[PDB]
Every structure is written in C-alpha cells, then in structure tokens.
Design an enzyme around this catalytic site. Sequence first.
Site, PDB file in Angstrom:
ATOM      1  N   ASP A  19       0.836  -1.219   0.000  1.00 12.56           N
ATOM      2  CA  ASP A  19       0.000   0.000   0.000  1.00 12.56           C
ATOM      3  C   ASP A  19       0.856   1.247   0.000  1.00 12.56           C
ATOM      4  N   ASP A  70      -9.622 -10.313   9.858  1.00 17.04           N
ATOM      5  CA  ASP A  70     -11.035 -10.434   9.568  1.00 17.04           C
ATOM      6  C   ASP A  70     -11.428  -9.638   8.291  1.00 17.04           C
ATOM      7  N   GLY A  73     -11.479  -3.554   7.431  1.00 16.61           N
ATOM      8  CA  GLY A  73     -12.176  -2.983   8.563  1.00 16.61           C
ATOM      9  C   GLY A  73     -12.130  -3.856   9.772  1.00 16.61           C
ATOM     10  N   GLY A  85      10.320 -14.985  21.303  1.00 12.06           N
ATOM     11  CA  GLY A  85       9.636 -15.548  20.172  1.00 12.06           C
ATOM     12  C   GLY A  85       8.622 -14.577  19.647  1.00 12.06           C
ATOM     13  N   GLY A  87       6.526 -13.094  21.235  1.00 12.15           N
ATOM     14  CA  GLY A  87       6.405 -11.995  22.156  1.00 12.15           C
ATOM     15  C   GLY A  87       6.908 -10.699  21.552  1.00 12.15           C
ATOM     16  N   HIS A  91       1.481  -7.284  14.338  1.00  8.47           N
ATOM     17  CA  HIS A  91       0.960  -7.682  13.075  1.00  8.47           C
ATOM     18  C   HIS A  91      -0.056  -6.698  12.577  1.00  8.47           C
ATOM     19  N   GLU A  96      -6.482  -4.015   5.334  1.00  7.89           N
ATOM     20  CA  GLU A  96      -6.594  -2.525   5.412  1.00  7.89           C
ATOM     21  C   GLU A  96      -5.754  -1.870   4.337  1.00  7.89           C
ATOM     22  N   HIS A 113      -0.063   2.500  18.633  1.00  9.57           N
ATOM     23  CA  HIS A 113      -0.957   1.695  19.489  1.00  9.57           C
ATOM     24  C   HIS A 113      -0.405   0.329  19.696  1.00  9.57           C
ATOM     25  N   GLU A 114       0.005  -0.339  18.615  1.00  9.79           N
ATOM     26  CA  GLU A 114       0.487  -1.702  18.753  1.00  9.79           C
ATOM     27  C   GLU A 114       1.753  -1.804  19.488  1.00  9.79           C
ATOM     28  N   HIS A 117       1.087  -2.001  22.977  1.00 12.04           N
ATOM     29  CA  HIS A 117       0.874  -3.400  23.355  1.00 12.04           C
ATOM     30  C   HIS A 117       2.151  -4.233  23.387  1.00 12.04           C
ATOM     31  N   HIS A 123      -5.425  -1.347  27.443  1.00 12.07           N
ATOM     32  CA  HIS A 123      -6.193  -0.248  26.883  1.00 12.07           C
ATOM     33  C   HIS A 123      -6.511   0.853  27.852  1.00 12.07           C
TER      34      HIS A 123
HETATM   35  C1  LIG Z   1     -27.307  -0.447  16.655  1.00 16.82           C
HETATM   36  C2  LIG Z   1     -25.870  -0.828  16.803  1.00 16.82           C
HETATM   37  N1  LIG Z   1     -25.397  -1.769  15.741  1.00 16.82           N
HETATM   38  C3  LIG Z   1     -25.266  -1.551  14.395  1.00 16.82           C
HETATM   39  C4  LIG Z   1     -25.711  -0.242  13.808  1.00 16.82           C
HETATM   40  C5  LIG Z   1     -25.752   0.197  12.525  1.00 16.82           C
HETATM   41  C6  LIG Z   1     -26.263   1.577  12.394  1.00 16.82           C
HETATM   42  C7  LIG Z   1     -26.415   2.379  11.334  1.00 16.82           C
HETATM   43  C8  LIG Z   1     -26.093   2.083   9.934  1.00 16.82           C
HETATM   44  C9  LIG Z   1     -26.189   3.029   8.739  1.00 16.82           C
HETATM   45  N2  LIG Z   1     -26.597   4.344   8.647  1.00 16.82           N
HETATM   46  C10 LIG Z   1     -27.087   5.254   9.702  1.00 16.82           C
HETATM   47  C11 LIG Z   1     -26.188   6.461   9.960  1.00 16.82           C
HETATM   48  C12 LIG Z   1     -24.748   6.081  10.293  1.00 16.82           C
HETATM   49  C13 LIG Z   1     -23.742   7.145   9.826  1.00 16.82           C
HETATM   50  C14 LIG Z   1     -22.363   6.520   9.830  1.00 16.82           C
HETATM   51  O1  LIG Z   1     -21.796   6.299   8.740  1.00 16.82           O
HETATM   52  N3  LIG Z   1     -21.966   6.060  11.032  1.00 16.82           N
HETATM   53  C15 LIG Z   1     -21.208   4.808  11.153  1.00 16.82           C
HETATM   54  C16 LIG Z   1     -22.169   3.615  11.348  1.00 16.82           C
HETATM   55  C17 LIG Z   1     -22.776   3.579  12.756  1.00 16.82           C
HETATM   56  O2  LIG Z   1     -22.380   2.387  13.433  1.00 16.82           O
HETATM   57  C18 LIG Z   1     -22.606   2.417  14.843  1.00 16.82           C
HETATM   58  C19 LIG Z   1     -21.524   1.565  15.527  1.00 16.82           C
HETATM   59  O3  LIG Z   1     -20.954   2.203  16.678  1.00 16.82           O
HETATM   60  C20 LIG Z   1     -20.378   3.458  16.375  1.00 16.82           C
HETATM   61  C21 LIG Z   1     -18.985   3.574  16.964  1.00 16.82           C
HETATM   62  O4  LIG Z   1     -18.057   3.108  15.972  1.00 16.82           O
HETATM   63  C22 LIG Z   1     -16.877   3.923  15.866  1.00 16.82           C
HETATM   64  C23 LIG Z   1     -16.043   3.461  14.674  1.00 16.82           C
HETATM   65  C24 LIG Z   1     -14.982   2.460  15.077  1.00 16.82           C
HETATM   66  N4  LIG Z   1     -13.862   2.036  14.663  1.00 16.82           N
HETATM   67  C25 LIG Z   1     -13.433   0.822  14.403  1.00 16.82           C
HETATM   68  O5  LIG Z   1     -14.121  -0.143  14.748  1.00 16.82           O
HETATM   69  C26 LIG Z   1     -12.172   0.568  13.565  1.00 16.82           C
HETATM   70  C27 LIG Z   1     -12.475   0.129  12.165  1.00 16.82           C
HETATM   71  C28 LIG Z   1     -12.572   1.295  11.193  1.00 16.82           C
HETATM   72  C29 LIG Z   1     -12.509   0.769   9.766  1.00 16.82           C
HETATM   73  O6  LIG Z   1     -13.566   0.383   9.278  1.00 16.82           O
HETATM   74  O7  LIG Z   1     -11.322   0.711   9.097  1.00 16.82           O
HETATM   75  N5  LIG Z   1     -11.592  -0.549  14.301  1.00 16.82           N
HETATM   76  C30 LIG Z   1     -10.908  -0.366  15.407  1.00 16.82           C
HETATM   77  O8  LIG Z   1     -10.650   0.736  15.879  1.00 16.82           O
HETATM   78  C31 LIG Z   1     -10.525  -1.643  16.070  1.00 16.82           C
HETATM   79  C32 LIG Z   1     -11.769  -2.075  16.880  1.00 16.82           C
HETATM   80  C33 LIG Z   1     -11.430  -3.187  17.865  1.00 16.82           C
HETATM   81  C34 LIG Z   1     -12.415  -3.326  18.991  1.00 16.82           C
HETATM   82  O9  LIG Z   1     -13.269  -4.181  18.847  1.00 16.82           O
HETATM   83  O10 LIG Z   1     -12.323  -2.545  20.093  1.00 16.82           O
HETATM   84  N6  LIG Z   1      -9.386  -1.642  16.980  1.00 16.82           N
HETATM   85  C35 LIG Z   1      -8.258  -2.304  16.586  1.00 16.82           C
HETATM   86  O11 LIG Z   1      -8.143  -2.823  15.516  1.00 16.82           O
HETATM   87  C36 LIG Z   1      -7.166  -2.477  17.563  1.00 16.82           C
HETATM   88  C37 LIG Z   1      -5.882  -2.035  16.912  1.00 16.82           C
HETATM   89  C38 LIG Z   1      -5.697  -0.545  16.824  1.00 16.82           C
HETATM   90  C39 LIG Z   1      -6.110   0.484  17.628  1.00 16.82           C
HETATM   91  C40 LIG Z   1      -5.579   1.696  17.018  1.00 16.82           C
HETATM   92  C41 LIG Z   1      -5.706   3.102  17.470  1.00 16.82           C
HETATM   93  C42 LIG Z   1      -6.458   3.435  18.538  1.00 16.82           C
HETATM   94  C43 LIG Z   1      -6.490   4.744  18.994  1.00 16.82           C
HETATM   95  C44 LIG Z   1      -5.823   5.746  18.325  1.00 16.82           C
HETATM   96  C45 LIG Z   1      -5.953   7.170  18.811  1.00 16.82           C
HETATM   97  C46 LIG Z   1      -6.464   7.462  20.064  1.00 16.82           C
HETATM   98  C47 LIG Z   1      -6.573   8.782  20.503  1.00 16.82           C
HETATM   99  C48 LIG Z   1      -6.266   9.825  19.630  1.00 16.82           C
HETATM  100  C49 LIG Z   1      -5.780   9.551  18.362  1.00 16.82           C
HETATM  101 CL1  LIG Z   1      -5.359  10.859  17.219  1.00 16.82          CL
HETATM  102  C50 LIG Z   1      -5.651   8.241  17.941  1.00 16.82           C
HETATM  103  C51 LIG Z   1      -5.089   5.422  17.186  1.00 16.82           C
HETATM  104  C52 LIG Z   1      -5.014   4.125  16.745  1.00 16.82           C
HETATM  105  N7  LIG Z   1      -4.915   1.398  15.919  1.00 16.82           N
HETATM  106  O12 LIG Z   1      -4.995   0.049  15.811  1.00 16.82           O
HETATM  107  C53 LIG Z   1      -7.094  -3.941  17.850  1.00 16.82           C
HETATM  108  P1  LIG Z   1      -6.053  -4.344  19.264  1.00 16.82           P
HETATM  109  O13 LIG Z   1      -6.466  -3.527  20.428  1.00 16.82           O
HETATM  110  O14 LIG Z   1      -4.499  -4.252  18.946  1.00 16.82           O
HETATM  111  C54 LIG Z   1      -6.436  -6.007  19.721  1.00 16.82           C
HETATM  112  C55 LIG Z   1      -6.650  -6.999  18.775  1.00 16.82           C
HETATM  113  C56 LIG Z   1      -6.962  -8.323  19.151  1.00 16.82           C
HETATM  114  C57 LIG Z   1      -7.090  -8.624  20.531  1.00 16.82           C
HETATM  115 BR1  LIG Z   1      -7.492 -10.367  21.104  1.00 16.82          BR
HETATM  116  C58 LIG Z   1      -6.939  -7.631  21.451  1.00 16.82           C
HETATM  117  C59 LIG Z   1      -6.609  -6.325  21.071  1.00 16.82           C
HETATM  118  C60 LIG Z   1     -26.499   4.736   7.339  1.00 16.82           C
HETATM  119  C61 LIG Z   1     -26.785   5.940   6.689  1.00 16.82           C
HETATM  120  C62 LIG Z   1     -26.601   6.102   5.312  1.00 16.82           C
HETATM  121  C63 LIG Z   1     -26.118   5.043   4.523  1.00 16.82           C
HETATM  122  C64 LIG Z   1     -25.912   5.183   3.117  1.00 16.82           C
HETATM  123  S1  LIG Z   1     -26.208   6.523   2.244  1.00 16.82           S
HETATM  124  O15 LIG Z   1     -26.000   6.292   0.628  1.00 16.82           O
HETATM  125  O16 LIG Z   1     -27.752   6.962   2.460  1.00 16.82           O
HETATM  126  O17 LIG Z   1     -25.217   7.776   2.596  1.00 16.82           O
HETATM  127  C65 LIG Z   1     -25.430   4.078   2.409  1.00 16.82           C
HETATM  128  C66 LIG Z   1     -25.146   2.875   3.052  1.00 16.82           C
HETATM  129  S2  LIG Z   1     -24.598   1.624   2.225  1.00 16.82           S
HETATM  130  O18 LIG Z   1     -23.455   0.848   3.086  1.00 16.82           O
HETATM  131  O19 LIG Z   1     -25.844   0.615   1.938  1.00 16.82           O
HETATM  132  O20 LIG Z   1     -23.939   2.127   0.818  1.00 16.82           O
HETATM  133  C67 LIG Z   1     -25.343   2.745   4.419  1.00 16.82           C
HETATM  134  C68 LIG Z   1     -25.828   3.812   5.178  1.00 16.82           C
HETATM  135  C69 LIG Z   1     -26.025   3.675   6.573  1.00 16.82           C
HETATM  136  C70 LIG Z   1     -25.773   2.456   7.415  1.00 16.82           C
HETATM  137  C71 LIG Z   1     -26.706   1.282   7.040  1.00 16.82           C
HETATM  138  C72 LIG Z   1     -24.266   2.098   7.474  1.00 16.82           C
HETATM  139  C73 LIG Z   1     -24.643  -2.709  13.634  1.00 16.82           C
HETATM  140  C74 LIG Z   1     -23.290  -2.311  13.011  1.00 16.82           C
HETATM  141  C75 LIG Z   1     -25.641  -3.295  12.611  1.00 16.82           C
HETATM  142  C76 LIG Z   1     -24.452  -3.632  14.825  1.00 16.82           C
HETATM  143  C77 LIG Z   1     -24.917  -3.013  16.027  1.00 16.82           C
HETATM  144  C78 LIG Z   1     -24.825  -3.688  17.250  1.00 16.82           C
HETATM  145  C79 LIG Z   1     -24.300  -4.988  17.273  1.00 16.82           C
HETATM  146  C80 LIG Z   1     -23.826  -5.642  16.101  1.00 16.82           C
HETATM  147  C81 LIG Z   1     -23.291  -6.955  16.180  1.00 16.82           C
HETATM  148  S3  LIG Z   1     -23.167  -7.798  17.621  1.00 16.82           S
HETATM  149  O21 LIG Z   1     -22.481  -9.274  17.441  1.00 16.82           O
HETATM  150  O22 LIG Z   1     -22.283  -6.999  18.468  1.00 16.82           O
HETATM  151  O23 LIG Z   1     -24.430  -8.069  18.218  1.00 16.82           O
HETATM  152  C82 LIG Z   1     -22.828  -7.568  15.020  1.00 16.82           C
HETATM  153  C83 LIG Z   1     -22.923  -6.923  13.767  1.00 16.82           C
HETATM  154  S4  LIG Z   1     -22.322  -7.693  12.401  1.00 16.82           S
HETATM  155  O24 LIG Z   1     -22.913  -7.093  11.239  1.00 16.82           O
HETATM  156  O25 LIG Z   1     -20.702  -7.429  12.426  1.00 16.82           O
HETATM  157  O26 LIG Z   1     -22.524  -9.120  12.416  1.00 16.82           O
HETATM  158  C84 LIG Z   1     -23.454  -5.623  13.689  1.00 16.82           C
HETATM  159  C85 LIG Z   1     -23.909  -4.943  14.846  1.00 16.82           C
HETATM  160 CA   LIG Z   2      -9.387  -6.108   9.494  1.00 12.64          CA
HETATM  161 CA   LIG Z   3      -3.404  -3.417   2.100  1.00 14.21          CA
HETATM  162 CA   LIG Z   4       9.497 -11.222  19.288  1.00 12.81          CA
HETATM  163 ZN   LIG Z   5      -0.974 -12.152  14.091  1.00 15.23          ZN
HETATM  164 ZN   LIG Z   6      -5.258  -2.297  21.417  1.00 15.85          ZN
END
Ligand SMILES: CCN1/C(=C/C/C=C\C=C2/N(CCCCC(=O)NCCCOCCOCCOCCCNC(=O)[C@H](CCC(=O)O)NC(=O)[C@H](CCC(=O)O)NC(=O)[C@H](Cc3cc(-c4ccc(-c5cccc(Cl)c5)cc4)no3)CP(=O)(O)c3ccc(Br)cc3)c3ccc4c(S(=O)(=O)O)cc(S(=O)(=O)O)cc4c3C2(C)C)C(C)(C)c2c1ccc1c(S(=O)(=O)O)cc(S(=O)(=O)O)cc21
Ligand SMILES: [Ca+2]
Ligand SMILES: [Ca+2]
Ligand SMILES: [Ca+2]
Ligand SMILES: [Zn+2]
Ligand SMILES: [Zn+2]
Length: 158
Positions: A19, A70, A73, A85, A87, A91, A96, A113-114, A117, A123
């Site tokens: 990216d 997953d 998002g 290791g 530890g 990742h 994204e 943030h990571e 950790h 948190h």
């Molecule tokens: C009722 C409730 N519910 C629901 C609902 C729905 C509603 C509505 C809809 C709609 N509409 C109306 C209006 C609206 C407007 C707007 O747009 N808004 C939005 C939507 C709303 O929603 C609500 C929800 O809540 C709110 C809040 O949120 C906030 C956001 C967030 N964020 C997040 O998440 C991220 C992602 C982003 C992306 O995407 O990329 N993520 C995160 O953050 C993560 C999380 C995790 C947890 O879990 O906690 N985190 C992470 O990753 C970590 C890492 C990291 C961290 C970081 C950082 C931090 C921090 C920072 C800072 C701080 C301070 C300062 C500064 Cl500068 C910075 C930085 C950084 N980094 O990295 C992880 P870790 O920790 O490492 C870990 C791991 C692993 C382990 Br073992 C441990 C640890 C509407 C309207 C309109 C429309 C349209 S138009 O054309 O008309 O404009 C259109 C459309 S379409 O699409 O058709 O085209 C549409 C529309 C609309 C609609 C329809 C959209 C729902 C969602 C349904 C639900 C509910 C409840 C429940 C549920 C469930 S359960 O199971 O729970 O029951 C389920 C479901 S499913 O589907 O999934 O199955 C669902 C549900």
């Molecule tokens: Ca993801």
């Molecule tokens: Ca990517």
């Molecule tokens: Ca390591």
């Molecule tokens: Zn991993």
């Molecule tokens: Zn976290």
Amino acid sequence: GPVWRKHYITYRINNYTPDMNREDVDYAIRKAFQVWSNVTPLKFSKINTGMADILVVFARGAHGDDHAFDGKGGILAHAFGPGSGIGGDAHFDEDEFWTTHSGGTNLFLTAVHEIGHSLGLGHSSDPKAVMFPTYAYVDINTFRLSADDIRGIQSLYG
Ligand SMILES: CCN1/C(=C/C/C=C\C=C2/N(CCCCC(=O)NCCCOCCOCCOCCCNC(=O)[C@H](CCC(=O)O)NC(=O)[C@H](CCC(=O)O)NC(=O)[C@H](Cc3cc(-c4ccc(-c5cccc(Cl)c5)cc4)no3)CP(=O)(O)c3ccc(Br)cc3)c3ccc4c(S(=O)(=O)O)cc(S(=O)(=O)O)cc4c3C2(C)C)C(C)(C)c2c1ccc1c(S(=O)(=O)O)cc(S(=O)(=O)O)cc21
Ligand SMILES: [Ca+2]
Ligand SMILES: [Ca+2]
Ligand SMILES: [Ca+2]
Ligand SMILES: [Zn+2]
Ligand SMILES: [Zn+2]
Ligand SMILES: [Br-]
C-alpha cells in the site's frame, strides 16, 4: 503483566505492505517507536536482517498465530506483549489500506498503538489516549501522547 527486562529493544520489519512505498513504511514505524522512546528510558534500534525483539508483519486472514484477521475494517492490527519468540511482535492486517496520512488507515498511529501493546500496555478508557481501543486520526504534527499513555508506560519502564 510482562515487561521487557532490558531497555535496549530491537525491531525488524519482516515485510512491507504494497500500500505504501518502503521509505514511508520505514519512517512510519520509526516515528512510532520514537513516540514511546520520548517518554521512557527505552531505546529502539532498527535491524534489516537477523534477530530482533519486535517483528513487524503485514499479513491477511489467518497468518500462523491463532489470531486470524477479519478482512477490511474491523480489527486493524494486533500485537503480543513482552516475551521471547512471538512476544513483542506486531501484526498489521493487509486487508486494510495503510497510508501516510488519512484516506485509509494511518500506519504511524496504528503502530503507536500496537507498539504500546508490544511494550506491555493494555487499553485506556480515555478517547484522547492512543491506547484507546478504537482508531482515530490526527495529523502527525498535531499528535500528542496523552497523560494516561505516559502514566501507563512510565509505570512499566520509568
Ligand atoms: C445499533 C448498533 N449496531 C449496528 C448499527 C448500525 C447503524 C447504522 C447504519 C447506517 N446508517 C445510519 C447512519 C450512520 C452514519 C455513519 O456512517 N456512522 C457509522 C455507522 C454507525 O455504526 C454504529 C456503531 O458504533 C459506532 C462507533 O463506531 C466507531 C467506529 C470504530 N472504529 C473501528 O471499529 C475501527 C475500524 C474502522 C474501519 O472500518 O477501518 N476498528 C478499530 O478501531 C478496532 C476495533 C477493535 C475493537 O473491537 O475494540 N481496533 C483495533 O483494531 C485495535 C488495533 C488498533 C487500535 C488503534 C488506534 C487506537 C487509537 C488511536 C488514537 C487514540 C486517541 C487519539 C488519536 Cl489521534 C488516535 C489510534 C489508533 N490502531 O490500531 C485492535 P487491538 O487492540 O491491537 C487487539 C486486537 C486483538 C485482541 Br485479542 C486484542 C486487542 C447509514 C446511513 C446512510 C447510509 C448510506 S447513504 O448512501 O444513504 O449515505 C449508504 C449505506 S450503504 O453501506 O448501503 O452504501 C449505508 C448507510 C447507513 C448504514 C446502514 C451504514 C450494527 C453495526 C448493525 C451492529 C450493532 C450492534 C451490534 C452488532 C453486532 S453484535 O455481534 O455486536 O451483536 C454484530 C454486527 S455484524 O454485522 O458485524 O454481524 C453488527 C452490529
Ligand atoms: Ca481487518
Ligand atoms: Ca493493504
Ligand atoms: Ca518477538
Ligand atoms: Zn498475528
Ligand atoms: Zn489495542
Ligand atoms: Br493477540
């Protein structure tokens, strides 16, 4: 929970997302590590080839570790906590679309943030904190580690 028992920690970029250009990936990851190095005594060193503590991987779906990705998002990435290791390793889901800025998932921010950790942080419930569970974007020049992140990471390393 686990912490690295050393302050000198190495990383290696196992593979590069198509990216982005390679230089951009390197820079993104480098800056992400720098975030944490700026507030801890940790020092991070990039390795191109060979043994490293933190391996960075870009892969999709099921990719060998029992935590399948997953598709586009949802879950963007994951990382294991400190240890040998797998530890430490971080990742990134290749289904994204990784980017230098917005218009996809920002690699720098996700990596921050990571790596958090990777270093042993959980948190935050504070949405201003990088360790908040869900992704948000700001420009790198606007980005600041929150007080909660600093408190977190300094509780582990200092
Ligand atoms: C009722 C409730 N519910 C629901 C609902 C729905 C509603 C509505 C809809 C709609 N509409 C109306 C209006 C609206 C407007 C707007 O747009 N808004 C939005 C939507 C709303 O929603 C609500 C929800 O809540 C709110 C809040 O949120 C906030 C956001 C967030 N964020 C997040 O998440 C991220 C992602 C982003 C992306 O995407 O990329 N993520 C995160 O953050 C993560 C999380 C995790 C947890 O879990 O906690 N985190 C992470 O990753 C970590 C890492 C990291 C961290 C970081 C950082 C931090 C921090 C920072 C800072 C701080 C301070 C300062 C500064 Cl500068 C910075 C930085 C950084 N980094 O990295 C992880 P870790 O920790 O490492 C870990 C791991 C692993 C382990 Br073992 C441990 C640890 C509407 C309207 C309109 C429309 C349209 S138009 O054309 O008309 O404009 C259109 C459309 S379409 O699409 O058709 O085209 C549409 C529309 C609309 C609609 C329809 C959209 C729902 C969602 C349904 C639900 C509910 C409840 C429940 C549920 C469930 S359960 O199971 O729970 O029951 C389920 C479901 S499913 O589907 O999934 O199955 C669902 C549900
Ligand atoms: Ca993801
Ligand atoms: Ca990517
Ligand atoms: Ca390591
Ligand atoms: Zn991993
Ligand atoms: Zn976290
Ligand atoms: Br995991």
